[PDB]
Amino acid sequence: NMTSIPQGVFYQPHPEPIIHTERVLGLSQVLMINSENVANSANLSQETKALLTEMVNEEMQGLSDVMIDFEIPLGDPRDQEQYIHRKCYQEFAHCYLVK
Amino acid sequence: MGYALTGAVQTLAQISDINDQNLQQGIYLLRDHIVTLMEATLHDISIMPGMFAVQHVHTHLNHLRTMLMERRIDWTYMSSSWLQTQLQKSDDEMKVIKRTARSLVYYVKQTYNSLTATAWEIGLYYELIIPRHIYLNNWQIVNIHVTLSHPYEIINRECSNTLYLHLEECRRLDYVICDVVKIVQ
Amino acid sequence: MPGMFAVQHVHTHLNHLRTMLMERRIDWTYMSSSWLQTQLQKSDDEMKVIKRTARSLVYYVKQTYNSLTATAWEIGLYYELIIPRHIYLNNWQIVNI
Amino acid sequence: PCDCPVWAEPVKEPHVQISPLKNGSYLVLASSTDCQIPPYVPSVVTVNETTQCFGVTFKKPLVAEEKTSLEPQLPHLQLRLPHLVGIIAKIKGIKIEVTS
Ligand SMILES: *[C@@H]1O[C@H](CO)[C@@H](O[C@@H]2O[C@H](CO)[C@@H](O)[C@H](O)[C@H]2NC(C)=O)[C@H](O)[C@H]1NC(C)=O
Ligand SMILES: *[C@@H]1O[C@H](CO)[C@@H](O[C@@H]2O[C@H](CO)[C@@H](O)[C@H](O)[C@H]2NC(C)=O)[C@H](O)[C@H]1NC(C)=O
Ligand SMILES: *[C@@H]1O[C@H](CO)[C@@H](O[C@@H]2O[C@H](CO)[C@@H](O)[C@H](O)[C@H]2NC(C)=O)[C@H](O)[C@H]1NC(C)=O
Numbered sequence: 001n002m003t004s005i006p007q008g009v010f011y012q013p014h015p016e017p018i019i020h021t022e023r024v025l026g027l028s029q030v031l032m033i034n035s036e037n038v039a040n041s042a043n044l045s046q047e048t049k050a051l052l053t054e055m056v057n058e059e060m061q062g063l064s065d066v067m068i069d070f071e072i073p074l075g076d077p078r079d080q081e082q083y084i085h086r087k088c089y090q091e092f093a094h095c096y097l098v099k
Numbered sequence: 100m101g102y103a104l105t106g107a108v109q110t111l112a113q114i115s116d117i118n119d120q121n122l123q124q125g126i127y128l129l130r131d132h133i134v135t136l137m138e139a140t141l142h143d144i145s146i147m148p149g150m151f152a153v154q155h156v157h158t159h160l161n162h163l164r165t166m167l168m169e170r171r172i173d174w175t176y177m178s179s180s181w182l183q184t185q186l187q188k189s190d191d192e193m194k195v196i197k198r199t200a201r202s203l204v205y206y207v208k209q210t211y212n213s214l215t216a217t218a219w220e221i222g223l224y225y226e227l228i229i230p231r232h233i234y235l236n237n238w239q240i241v242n243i244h245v246t247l248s249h250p251y252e253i254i255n256r257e258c259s260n261t262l263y264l265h266l267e268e269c270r271r272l273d274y275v276i277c278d279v280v281k282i283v284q
Numbered sequence: 285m286p287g288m289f290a291v292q293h294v295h296t297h298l299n300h301l302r303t304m305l306m307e308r309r310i311d312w313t314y315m316s317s318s319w320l321q322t323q324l325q326k327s328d329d330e331m332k333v334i335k336r337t338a339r340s341l342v343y344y345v346k347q348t349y350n351s352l353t354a355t356a357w358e359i360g361l362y363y364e365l366i367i368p369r370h371i372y373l374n375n376w377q378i379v380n381i
Numbered sequence: 382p383c384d385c386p387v388w389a390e391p392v393k394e395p396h397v398q399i400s401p402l403k404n405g406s407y408l409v410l411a412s413s414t415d416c417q418i419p420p421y422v423p424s425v426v427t428v429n430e431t432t433q434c435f436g437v438t439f440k441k442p443l444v445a446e447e448k449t450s451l452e453p454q455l456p457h458l459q460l461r462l463p464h465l466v467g468i469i470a471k472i473k474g475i476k477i478e479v480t481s
């Protein structure tokens with residue numbers, strides 16, 4: 001059986017889909033990790049916390065060592081109102097004074 | 100030391116302004132950051148007594164690293180329902196948006212250091228590309244001494260409809276995304 | 285780490301090593317950073333750029349002692365580190381119109 | 382910066398070269414004198430009101446906060462005018478070197 005490919009063009013499958021670009025959005029997220037907060041819920045012993053802090057620091061140093069810093073032109077995240085509330089609550093939520 | 104991205108940038112203010120009819124292609128940013136706590140993202144830290152808890156944290160933390168080394172976003176710290184409701188997109192649109200998303204780390208800082216308690220902060224910059232035209236079924240053209248030349252390089256066939264697509268200035272990700280596509284007879 | 289916990293730890297760490305070696309990357313938990321930094325006398329940024337762009341290779345895995353209770357394995361690893369001479373961070377690409 | 386050769390190619394008029402950018406401007410190459418564009422000089426254009434020129438719709442940008450730039454201010458130099466060499470371009474059309 002002989003067939004003539006019309007018009008001088010042949011075609012093969014291409015599994016990769018195609019996407020047409022539109023407005024490209026970007027957002028910034030600041031993630032804060034505190035060992036004390038997770039320690040309180042776990043009812044965790046003193047020596048076990050001494051182990052947990054070192055376990056966290058090893059991974060944090062490993063992550064921070066293999067990446068260099070860049071500059072996002074958004075601005076300073078300090079002045080954000082939500083960040084202020086979150087930062088006060090992370091550490092100073094449950095402290096009181098009695099006279 | 101520290102690199103930089105230079106040039107003034109346009110900003111969308113509130114997040115639901117991405118879908119309009121008066122803005123064109125470009126890089127758009129949000130005015131305010133998103134503050135996230137690891138202890139608030141995990142829904143099962145409690146009800147895990149003894150040593151088990153630390154293991155959980157370790158595992159999850161390890162997973163995060165296995166993400167950030169590959170320039171990919173871990174969505175355990177980003178609720179899908181919130182973004183889906185803000186963008187008002189379809190399920191397939193959400194899938195294609197999340198699949199082809201890349202991340203970047205621009206500062207890791209240690210605030211409180213001690214023999215028992217430690218605290219860390221991580222900055223993450225994302226980039227999401229919303230679609231305008233998605234093509235699933237497509238065929239690639241080969242030409243087989245007369246050699247007639249052609250403008251179209253991809254062809255589409257779906258719903259008994261045939262289209263001819265030409266591509267230019269195209270970047271490659273897990274999928275194929277590109278900006279200049281014009282239908283040519 | 286008493287009881288069964290210990291084996292879990294090993295498993296996790298071992299799994300991590302595999303997730304490294306499949307991607308041709310170096311896991312530095314078995315290579316002290318302070319030793320190499322002191323031997324090379326480089327800066328922190330130089331250390332970061334050196335470690336980021338380092339590749340590894342496995343050239344022999346051998347099983348020495350085999351039994352129903354005790355086992356021992358040996359792994360050979362070949363690394364390649366590229367020290368820098370001139371690093372350029374800010375740069376622009378030229379198009380001609 | 383340029384000792385660098387030159388080679389050109391002629392094209393069948395007309396041609397419209399419009400390149401959008403990612404900050405709210407446009408690149409226009411004028412092969413004719415139409416709309417509002419000086420002839421025979423490529424340029425970058427930013428519009429004020431939403432118009433439709435050269436078979437392409439235009440949209441105005443939005444106010445952006447000024448920031449310090451690291452832009453590469455480029456030097457300046459001219460080229461050779463005589464048209465006789467350009468006749469060779471009409472002969473073949475393949476980009477052929479003319480010394481500079
Ligand atoms: C951590 O400790 C707290 C309090 O010590 C536990 O909270 C109580 O747990 C007991 C059971 O041990 C329950 O009967 C109570 O209803 C809980 N609440 C209060 C207010 O007493 C908590 O369960 C412990 N977490 C563990 C063991 O994982
Ligand atoms: C494993 O066993 C050894 C010895 O059986 C433990 O070492 C002793 O552990 C006890 C507590 O069980 C301590 O009071 C001693 O000071 C330890 N040393 C000596 C020389 O006796 C070791 O702690 C055990 N490891 C565990 C349980 O993880
Ligand atoms: C978008 O970018 C263009 C290109 O830079 C800006 O136009 C001028 O470009 C020259 C050199 O590139 C600069 O020296 C000028 O300062 C730029 N103009 C201004 C007003 O700063 C253009 O301004 C940018 N912004 C838009 C179009 O909104």
Ligand SMILES: *[C@@H]1O[C@H](CO)[C@@H](O)[C@H](O)[C@H]1NC(C)=O
Nearest residue numbers: 001002003004005006007010
């Ligand atoms: C292909 O060849 C077979 C014989 O093996 C024949 O029966 C069939 O009709 C042919 N198909 C065509 C000519 O389209």
